[PDB]
Every structure is written in structure tokens, then in C-alpha cells.
């Protein structure tokens, strides 16, 4: 039934909800090597399951990839004989050549009145948008020959079309374009490719061109696309009505160029308009798509199952960046979680957290000075000192804001970064015991500056890092301030989401090391803020620390900090 979608023709009762948001697939025990290795890839995946009454999806062990020897009547009989068909409500089928010698229907010709289809050649009329998944057409050349991983750059050919047995109209148009421009467009004729007094090897000739042309000759989907992606040339699909594989999750606009078959003689002019930077980006995207989804049958099966699981469980679906980012840019990505550009008003203030240990004369001055500032919603005092007891309630300073003392089970320097449920604001000032040389207007202006930039640190102390060539390692520098890359957490405004990140989402054992060494907490906070937000800090006005910086850089694998030369002062 082409008319129905997942909302009516799919049963979700079998897979209601699990703590591990993963779809459950079963393979019937009854084939080409392609289907055999596809089944093996399904078997050793996280989606495999037993106990048929507990599974949701069913994958039959039937050769349906190739329709040349399909025996449609036999396939229909097998689907009826599956013994768990149930109108084929939750059965997934894999196919890559859904075409017939009399006519290319661009879809599987089996009844499949309610089955789920994963085809290679899909037209806009034969594809269910919310139900089916378009999968790549496999070519053994991807695994048979291992082409070198040539980086993006200039190539001798600008356009290339290497296909055999094309329709005469497309060949004539390609020849017309070649004679119109010349020396950049190279059309090839009949594993071996032949030109006029020239012979080229098919797998390696594609590496010499930046744009490869894919034409609709039969089945609406050609295996040449996988080779095009492997070789790094940007595919140029000229099929009028054809949905590219995995177009639901992948962004083909950044990897392929679609030109309608009507403007086949205008392809070169269209391709000329694309700048070199976008050409390199599309080459990288094509290489990543091949190595992640087109290289192996296991990749196809995993991607299809992931798409289906995302459809079944939208709330646990993986991100667009996870789907279609190469690992290099994924390492280089930022993905700031506080990406919403809102300016909080002055109705809510900030909760001042004071960290004190074996000092009480400085505590009282700190509280008295902080109490002078407006917009002080709350003031919290953290008592890390376990042996010493807090002063009596009467002796506490007289303030008009709610003051409370936090009881600490242990004595760890990271107690200032714990997200307390008693805090009712998003801004959290962290002023320590010795910070007493600050005026009320300075703190008020710091909070004013923080309101414009709620997703980054706003602190008064200014420090920076540097790279030493003598030791080939990062150093620390504080005497001279020409640029600022770090801000000490003492008297530093930041979002309490940063406290949550520091406490819970910290790479490896960074916090367990700051506590052990009882130092380098501001360094860790600066590194975490730089790594998560991807933005610099705002400043408002030794060997151990260098080892801290080096260890933090080694844990991240890079330097998340950014160097800036700007500070905020009142107008």
C-alpha cells in the first residue's frame, strides 16, 4: 500500500519502550554473498535480538537485492510462507536494483502490501517519505580495489562521465559539451575505459577529476555513485526524479550536485559557479559518506537500522552532526548547548558562592562587601573545613539577602562547582575568601556584562597560556598581559550549567586530579568552558600549573582555549 505511512501501517505495540533506546530486529532462519554478509552484519550489531514475541522488526532471509532473477511469484509465495507475515506490518526488505527488463518501475515488484522497503533506485512517486529508507546500491569495486586517500586539491580534469552503454542522447550531449569547452571534460567509452587513442583504468581515472557525472540509464540508480564517492569526485546526478540514498538523514546538498536532465547541456556552467572551497567541502563529504555508509555492506545495514530506530524513537535520535560530519570536523566542531541568544532581565540576580578554609576574618569582609551590590539574589558560604566548626548564628554578618552555610562531607576544592538545588538563579558568582579588593559597582558592572554574554565566563582576574619551543610543550605566563586566554574562577560570573558540566560531564579524570593536587581548578573550568562553548572569555577591570595545563591539553587532545585581546569596561 503506497498510500499509508508509519502512522497507520506500522505497529509500535511490539516495541513500546526500553531503557536502551535501540530497535530489536530478528532474521528468519531459512542466498548471495552480499545478502549473507548483510545478515552477518545485522547479527553482530546492537539491534540483534531473540525471543520473537519480544522483537519488533523482522528481516527475512530471502534474496531480493537483485531483481533480474527475482522470480516475483516465488518471492510472494515466500512472503506468504514466512509464518509471521501478519500482512507484513513490521518486515524490512533490502533491495538495490528495483528495475524490470520490460519497464523500470523504480520500486520492488513483489506484492508487499504493507512491508517496509529499503531500495536503491527510488523515485519521488514510488518512495514513501516517512516510511521507506533509500539505501545505496552496492558495488564490489569499493572493497575490491583500495584507492589511495588523495587529499583535496587541483586535478587535471574538471568534468568526467565514465559510464558504459548510455542512451545516445546523453552521449551526444556529453560530446557536444566536450567539443564546446575541451581539455576539462573527458568522456570515456568501453573495468577498462577507452578514449580516442587513450586507455584509462576505471577505478583510478575518477581520481583525476573533481566532478563525476551520474546518469539515469536503467533502474534509476547506478552503482557508479559508490565509486564516485570513493574516488573523491563530487557526484553530479542528472536523474530527473530520483531520491539519493540516505537523503532522510544525510545532507546531499553539501556533497552532491543535482542537475535536471532537461538542462543536461547546461551542466558545465552550473558546475562553474561553485567555488573551490565548496568543492573541497563536497569532496570531503563524499569521501566521508563513502567510508561511513557506502564502503561496506555492514555500513549500509547499520545506517538503515539507525534511521529506522530514529524513526521509532525520535526522542533518542542521533543528531544531524553525528549523521553527516566527517570525524575531522566532528573533532573540530563546537555544538554550543547555550546557543539561544537571550538577554536575562534584572529581576533575577546571582548567587554568590564563597569558598573558605581556615579563615574567618576575610570571610566577614567578603560577605559585607558583596552585600553592598544590588541584584544579589542569594549568598551561599561553603565550609570546606571539616575539623573546624562554623561560627555561631549571631556572629554572622547582618544582611538583607538569604544567607546559608553549606555542610561539606569532605574537603575537596571542587565544592564551589557543585550545582546546588537551592540556587534559584542562572548566574553564579564565585568569589573566594581573599577576594576583598572589589567595589560594589565593579561587581554590578560585571553582572551587567555577563547578562549580554550568558554562555561564557565573565571574570576579573586575567591569565593566559603560551607555547614554548624549547621544551615543545605548553607553558604558563602571567607577568605581562597582552592577550587573555584564561580567567581565574575567583570572582568570575558564569552559568550554573558550567557547574553542572564541571561536576558531571568532565572528560576522563580531570576533577579527580584537581582534588588530589588541591590546585588548578580555575584552569580546569576555563578549559571546560572553552571546549564546550567554543567561545573565548570576557575579562572586566608555576611548574605545578604548567603541568596542569599540559595534562589538560593531553586529555582533550588539543587546546580548547582561545586567545583574545579585548576587555570590557564601562562606557
Amino acid at each position: 500500500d503506497l498510500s499509508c505511512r508509519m502512522h497507520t501501517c506500522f505497529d509500535v505495540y511490539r516495541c513500546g519502550f526500553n531503557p536502551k533506546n535501540k530497535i530489536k530486529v530478528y532474521i528468519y532462519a531459512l542466498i548471495s554473498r552480499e545478502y549473507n554478509e548483510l545478515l552477518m552484519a545485522i547479527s553482530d550489531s546492537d539491534y540483534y535480538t531473540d525471543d520473537i514475541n519480544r522483537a519488533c522488526l523482522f528481516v527475512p532471509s530471502i534474496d531480493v537485492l537483485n531483481q533480474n532473477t527475482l522470480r516475483i511469484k516465488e518471492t510472494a509465495q515466500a512472503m506468504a510462507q514466512l509464518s509471521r507475515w501478519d500482512r507484513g506490518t513490521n518486515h524490512l526488505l533490502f533491495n538495490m536494483l528495483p528495475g524490470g527488463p520490460p519497464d523500470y518501475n523504480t520500486a520492488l515488484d513483489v506484492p508487499r502490501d504493507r512491508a517496509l522497503l529499503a531500495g536503491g533506485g527510488f523515485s519521488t512517486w514510488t518512495y514513501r517519505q516517512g516510511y521507506d529508507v533509500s539505501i545505496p546500491v552496492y558495488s564490489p569495486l569499493s572493497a575490491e580495489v583500495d584507492l589511495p586517500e588523495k587529499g583535496p586539491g587541483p586535478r587535471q580534469y574538471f568534468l568526467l562521465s565514465s559510464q558504459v552503454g548510455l542512451h545516445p542522447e546523453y552521449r551526444e550531449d556529453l560530446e557536444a559539451l566536450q567539443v564546446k569547452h575541451g581539455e576539462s571534460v573527458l568522456v570515456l567509452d568501453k573495468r577498462k575505459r577507452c578514449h580516442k587513442h587513450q586507455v584509462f583504468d576505471y577505478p583510478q581515472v575518477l581520481q583525476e577529476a573533481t566532478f563525476c557525472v551520474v546518469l539515469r540509464g536503467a533502474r534509476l540508480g547506478q552503482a557508479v555513485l559508490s565509486d564516485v564517492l570513493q574516488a573523491g569526485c563530487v557526484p553530479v546526478v542528472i536523474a530527473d526524479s530520483y531520491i539519493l540514498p540516505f537523503s532522510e538523514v544525510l545532507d546531499w546538498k553539501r556533497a552532491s550536485v543535482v542537475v535536471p536532465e532537461e538542462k543536461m547541456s547546461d551542466v558545465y556552467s552550473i558546475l562553474q559557479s561553485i567555488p573551490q572551497r565548496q568543492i573541497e567541502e563536497m569532496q570531503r563529504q563524499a569521501r566521508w559518506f563513502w567510508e561511513a555508509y557506502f564502503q561496506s555492506i555492514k555500513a549500509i545495514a547499520l545506517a538503515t537500522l539507525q534511521i529506522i530506530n530514529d524513526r521509532i524513537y525520535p526522542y533518542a535520535a542521533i543528531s544531524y552532526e553525528e549523521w553527516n560530519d566527517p570525524p575531522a570536523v566532528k573533532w573540530g566542531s563546537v555544538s554550543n548547548p547555550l546557543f539561544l541568544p537571550l538577554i536575562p532581565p534584572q529581576s533575577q540576580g546571582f548567587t554568590a558562592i564563597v569558598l573558605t578554609y581556615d579563615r574567618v576574618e576575610s570571610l566577614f569582609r567578603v560577605i559585607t562587601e558583596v552585600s553592598k551590590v544590588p541584584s544579589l539574589s542569594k549568598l551561599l558560604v561553603v565550609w570546606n573545613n571539616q575539623n573546624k566548626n562554623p561560627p555561631e548564628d549571631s556572629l554572622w554578618p547582618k544582611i538583607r539577602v538569604p544567607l546559608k552555610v553549606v555542610r561539606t562531607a569532605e574537603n575537596k576544592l571542587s565544592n564551589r562547582f557543585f550545582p546546588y538545588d537551592e540556587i534559584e538563579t542562572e548566574a553564579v558568582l564565585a568569589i573566594d575568601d581573599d577576594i576583598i579588593m572589589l567595589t560594589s559597582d565593579e561587581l554590578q558592572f560585571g553582572y551587567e556584562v555577563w547578562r549580554e554574554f550568558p554562555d561564557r565566563l565573565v571574570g576579573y582576574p586575567g591569565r593566559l597560556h603560551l607555547w614554548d619551543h624549547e621544551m615543545n610543550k605548553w607553558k604558563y605566563e602571567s607577568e605581562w598581559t597582552n592577550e587573555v586566554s584564561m580567567v581565574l574562577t575567583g570572582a568570575a560570573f558564569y552559568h550554573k550549567y558550567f557547574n553542572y558540566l564541571y561536576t558531571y560531564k568532565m572528560p576522563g579524570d580531570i576533577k579527580n586530579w584537581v582534588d588530589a593536587h588541591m590546585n588548578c581548578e580555575d584552569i580546569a573550568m576555563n578549559f571546560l568552558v572553552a571546549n564546550v562553548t567554543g567561545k573565548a572569555v570576557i575579562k572586566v577591570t608555576m611548574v605545578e600549573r604548567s603541568e596542569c595545563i599540559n595534562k589538560f591539553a593531553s586529555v582533550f587532545g588539543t587546546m580548547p582555549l582561545k586567545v583574545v585581546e579585548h576587555r570590557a569596561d564601562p562606557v
Binding site: F17, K253, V571
Partner: protein
């Protein structure tokens, strides 16, 4: 074969008309004899006020009827009768080759099907509540079901004024609507008392919907009616974390827009509903999509959602509301932009433009389909802002000393001098001689040292989206005259920076040239000023962030700002009191 209900662009569309000229839409003239609803009038004014409007049918490759079509219910007060022969009488109908039809309601009481009434034929329908079983994947557009009180231009500026961690508030899942005793589409609401628990998940329904308030009431109306009180719906959407949006008479509802505005992550129950702008918007980032069949286990699924994902969903929901659903003009422009991007497959917005700030309505693929050419997606990629800028000088001597000082900058790739048609606002035109992304617009009367230029560029390096400039002016509201003011002396705060000594992006030049209507440009040219004001307005609107300051003519400014605010519908300008300086 393919020209019937299964219409696509490759069959039921004429690309030849759109290839000849730019993407233009034509509005049929009003007959001055038939009633027109307020919502349809707002849609028509948005179309006419847009840059795609033209009066010549031959030039345009898209048509929209002026006859009311939003209300297609036979019992609705806004229904237009005898439309079957009325639409056919048009000379330019041409069986709806390139006709776009806006719609909000369809069907009658017995069954709310796709009862459009008149035979659309090959025309594309922008109906609001479209089921996925009758939605053309690349022909139709799904729009939100707005009400008659939706603002024409501007917006409510959202509700989320504080981003508090944890995002959880004193509620988990709320609902206060009206159940239906008989009909189609009340099954999801009649079983909400199973899910209801009271402490955190509170679902309220009422069965008083007309004559059946006491006639056909079941043995549960009284319990529901008594508990349907002491809990304001508006006063509930503000303390709620997840808003339930089920299916009623029609798949769509006003509750979706209210949930988007109230920052509560919607949990849709309308099975098989094509979400608004689903072909370009990823709703898994701003909403939680659920199935009404698994209604019982919904609260467990909602609780299973992680805290950071809840924060991301709320922020993306607020962004979507502020970008695509704030006003009917935004909805119309979104539909028009989707249709326009549907034409050229090599010039189109990718899936990242729509779902990321600022959005597709401010990012034009005609400038470039490469994300690196825009200042918005540097962090999403592994790219860094360009290290060179092209200075622009508009001259109508200090300029001789100025050019030497600007040329000494290490990051200054080239200098372009403009000499004057004496159009003083033409300096924002995109020039092919500009290669680098960053552009410094400089006035011949401005004195600026090379070190200051280097500092401005290195500050802009950290903020490629905003404008960094030395001159700053702010805006104030005048209560006596009820109009916005303009001050330029000893202002404590600021919200605008003059383009004469400011650094910004060349895409801002392109957006100013190809986005703002001709009327504002004509007003600017006739008044011979107020171009930097409009540039700052556009940048504040696109970025939702204030600019950054670094270290008779006056009376025309008030009129300029009033006209700009009237066109925009609100005040994009945001006050700032910080001033970035070198350390």
C-alpha cells in the same frame, strides 16, 4: 498519470517561467464584491509586502488567488460559496500550473477530510493540517494553524526570559482542553485520565461543548468538570516543562503555537500529522514526537528524556518560534522561501541553515550555497573567520590621510573607493571586486588610526555575526509622543553602531540589497540618510543580539526609526552598556 493527486515539481510545475526571471509571485486582483477574512487579508498583505510580489502575471512564475480559501468548512462563517465555478472563471487559472493555495481548515462535522471544495488540479496547496498520507513530499507545504489574533508583523518575543538549570519546573506534563463525547478525534483525549496522576502530570478535559453539556454526558463528565478548575491554562503553560498537543476535530491546533511560545517542549499525539515546515525543519531538535497508540507509557518516556536534551529542545523551540512562527508574515515568507529553494537544486539551503540560527528566512542561498561564506556557521564547522578584510570608502585632505592609514593595516587586502547616480545608500551593494568576507565601510570624514583598525578587526574575529564600530547611538521610547526617539550625545547605553566606522560581513551587504523592500530604500534615498540605521536594524533582527562598541537632519532620524519599526513590527534594537577595549 502523475498529474493527479500524486503531483510533483517535475510534472505539475513549469520551471520555464521561473528560469526566465527571478522567483516572483502574483496576486489576483480583488473583486470588491466578496467578503475577505482578516487572516486571508494578513496573508495577502504579507505576500504583497514581500519582495516576491509583482503586478505582471507574465513575469511571475507563481500565483496565489485573492479569493478566500482558509475556511473551507460548510458551516463556517467565513466560507465562500460557489467557489467551484468561481475559481474556474479566472483567465489566469490555467488549471493551476503555478498556483499556490493557502488553507487553514477543511472538512465538515461528519468527517474532517481534505474537503478543499474546489478542484485544485495541479496547484500546490499550503494547507495547515495535512496528514502524511495525503502530503506530497516535494510539492505541498505544511504551515502552522494560526488564529485570527496572530500578529501581522513582529511578535510576542517568546516567554523564556531565564534559562534556569535544571530546566525542570514545578510540573512535568500538563493539558487543559475540551474533550468531545461524540465524533472523530476524541479517542486520545478521552483516555488521558489513565495517564493523569495529579502531582506532576495533570491532564484536564471538559465535555461541555454545546448541547451535550448535560444531554449525552457520560458517568465521568462530572468528575472531569469539577477537576477542570483552580488551574489556569496560561498560568499552567508557564510552569510546565512538556506541553501535550493531541488531535481533536483536526490534526492541527492553536495549542502548538502556544506551546512553542511558552517554551514547553511539545509532545504531539496527532498520529500522521505533517509537522509545520517538516521538509526543512528537524522537529526532533525542538520537540518530542510521540504516538498516541502508546499513550499509557508516555510519562515514563518523558521522564526518560535527559536534562541536557530537555535544555536543547527548549532552546530550539524558542528559536523556531522566534524565527518561523512568530507572525503570519514569517509563515508566508517561510513557505515562499521553501518554494523558491525547490526550484534550483544547486542553489538551495541545506538542512543546517533552517535548523540553526538565524534560520532560512535570513540566509539566502542565492548569495552562496556554501556555509563558509556566511558568518553564522564558523563554530559548527572547523573553520575560522577570514584573516583579511576589504575596506570600503564611500566618498561624495582628510581622506588622503585616511586611505594611507587604512592601507597600513596588515589584514587589509584591498581598499575600494566609491565616488558618486548620487545614491548615498548604494554603498551597501554587493561588489564582485570584494573577495574577502569581512568588509570595513569607511567615511571620508572619519579619522581612524591603523592600530585601531587592527583592534577592530581582531575584535570582529571573535564576533563575525555582529557589527563592531566606534560611533554608537541608542534609542529611547517617548511616552508623550508615543513614538521611538533617537539620541547621539552622552548616552549611558547604546544599541546601534554607525556603518561609517564599523566592521561587518559582506553577506550583510547582500542581505540589505536583496532582502529589504524597495520602499525602505526609496525612503532612505529620498531622505539622503538613515542607511546605517537600517543596516543596524537588519543586523539586530537577524542576530537577536546588540552590536559591540570599541575604543532638520536630526529630526529625520525619528521619522526614519518610526518607519523602520512599523515595517519590522517591533524594535530589534537591544541596549548595550559594555565597551570592548584592548588589554
Amino acid at each position: 498519470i502523475y498529474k493527479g493527486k500524486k503531483c510533483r515539481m517535475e510534472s505539475c510545475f513549469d520551471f520555464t517561467l521561473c528560469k526566465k526571471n527571478g522567483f516572483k509571485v502574483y496576486v489576483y486582483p480583488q473583486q470588491k464584491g466578496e467578503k475577505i477574512a482578516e487572516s486571508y487579508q494578513n496573508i495577502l498583505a504579507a505576500i504583497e509586502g514581500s519582495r516576491f510580489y509583482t503586478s505582471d502575471p507574465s513575469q511571475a512564475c507563481l500565483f496565489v488567488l485573492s479569493l478566500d480559501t482558509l475556511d473551507r468548512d460548510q458551516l463556517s462563517p467565513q466560507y465562500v460559496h460557489n467557489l467551484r465555478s468561481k475559481v474556474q472563471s479566472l483567465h489566469l487559472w490555467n488549471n493551476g500550473r503555478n498556483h499556490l493555495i493557502f488553507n487553514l481548515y477543511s472538512g465538515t462535522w461528519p468527517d474532517y477530510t481534505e474537503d478543499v471544495g474546489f478542484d485544485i488540479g495541479q496547484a500546490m496547496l499550503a494547507k495547515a493540517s495535512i496528514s502524511t498520507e495525503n502530503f506530497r513530499p516535494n510539492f505541498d507545504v505544511s504551515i502552522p494553524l494560526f488564529s485570527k489574533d496572530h500578529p501581522r508583523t513582529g511578535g510576542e518575543r517568546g516567554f523564556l526570559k531565564f534559562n534556569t538549570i535544571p530546566p525542570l519546573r514545578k510540573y512535568m506534563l500538563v493539558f487543559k482542553g475540551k474533550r468531545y463525547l461524540t465524533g472523530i478525534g476524541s479517542d486520545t483525549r478521552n483516555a488521558l485520565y489513565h495517564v493523569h496522576n495529579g502531582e506532576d502530570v495533570v491532564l484536564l478535559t471538559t465535555c461541555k461543548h454545546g448541547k451535550d453539556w448535560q444531554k449525552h454526558k457520560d458517568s465521568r463528565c462530572d468528575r472531569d468538570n469539577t477537576e477542570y478548575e483552580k488551574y489556569d491554562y496560561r498560568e499552567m503553560l508557564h510552569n510546565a516543562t512538556f506541553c501535550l498537543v493531541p488531535r481533536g476535530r483536526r490534526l492541527g491546533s492553536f495549542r502548538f503555537l502556544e506551546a512553542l511560545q511558552a517554551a514547553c517542549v511539545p509532545v504531539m499525539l496527532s498520529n500522521g500529522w505533517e509537522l509545520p515546515f517538516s521538509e526543512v525543519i528537524n522537529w526532533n531538535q525542538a520537540a518530542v514526537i510521540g504516538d498516541e497508540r502508546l499513550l499509557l507509557q508516555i510519562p515514563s518516556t518523558i521522564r526518560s528524556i535527559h536534562q541536557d536534551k530537555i535544555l536543547a529542545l527548549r532552546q530550539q523551540t524558542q528559536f523556531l518560534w522566534e524565527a518561523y512562527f512568530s507572525s503570519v508574515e514569517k509563515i508566508v515568507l517561510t513557505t515562499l522561501e521553501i518554494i523558491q529553494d525547490r526550484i534550483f537544486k544547486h542553489i538551495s539551503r541545506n538542512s543546517l541553515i533552517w535548523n540553526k540560527h538565524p534560520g532560512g528566512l535570513f540566509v539566502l542561498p542565492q548569495y552562496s550555497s556554501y556555509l563558509g561564506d556566511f558568518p553564522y556557521y564558523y563554530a559548527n564547522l572547523g573553520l575560522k573567520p577570514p584573516s583579511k578584510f576589504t575596506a570600503v570608502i564611500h566618498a561624495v585632505q582628510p581622506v588622503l590621510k585616511l586611505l594611507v592609514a587604512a592601507a597600513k593595516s596588515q589584514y587589509c587586502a584591498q581598499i575600494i573607493v566609491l565616488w558618486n547616480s548620487k545614491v548615498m545608500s548604494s554603498r551597501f551593494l554587493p561588489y564582485d571586486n570584494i573577495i574577502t568576507d569581512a568588509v570595513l565601510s569607511l567615511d571620508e570624514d572619519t579619522v581612524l588610526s591603523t592600530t585601531e583598525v587592527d583592534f577592530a578587526f581582531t575584535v570582529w574575529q571573535s564576533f563575525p555575526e555582529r557589527i563592531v564600530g566606534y560611533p554608537a547611538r541608542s534609542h529611547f521610547w517617548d511616552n508623550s509622543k508615543e513614538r521611538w526617539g533617537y539620541t547621539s550625545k552622552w548616552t549611558n547605553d547604546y544599541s546601534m553602531v554607525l556603518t561609517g566606522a564599523a566592521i561587518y560581513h559582506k553577506y550583510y551587504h547582500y542581505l540589505y540589497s536583496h532582502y529589504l523592500p524597495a520602499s525602505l530604500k526609496n525612503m532612505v534615498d529620498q531622505l539622503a540618510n538613515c542607511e546605517d540605521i537600517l543596516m543596524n536594524f537588519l543586523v539586530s533582527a537577524v542576530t537577536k543580539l546588540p552590536p559591540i562598541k570599541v575604543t532638520d537632519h536630526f529630526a529625520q532620524r525619528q521619522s526614519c526609526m518610526n518607519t523602520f519599526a512599523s515595517w519590522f513590527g517591533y524594535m530589534p534594537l537591544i541596549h548595550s552598556q559594555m565597551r570592548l577595549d584592548p588589554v
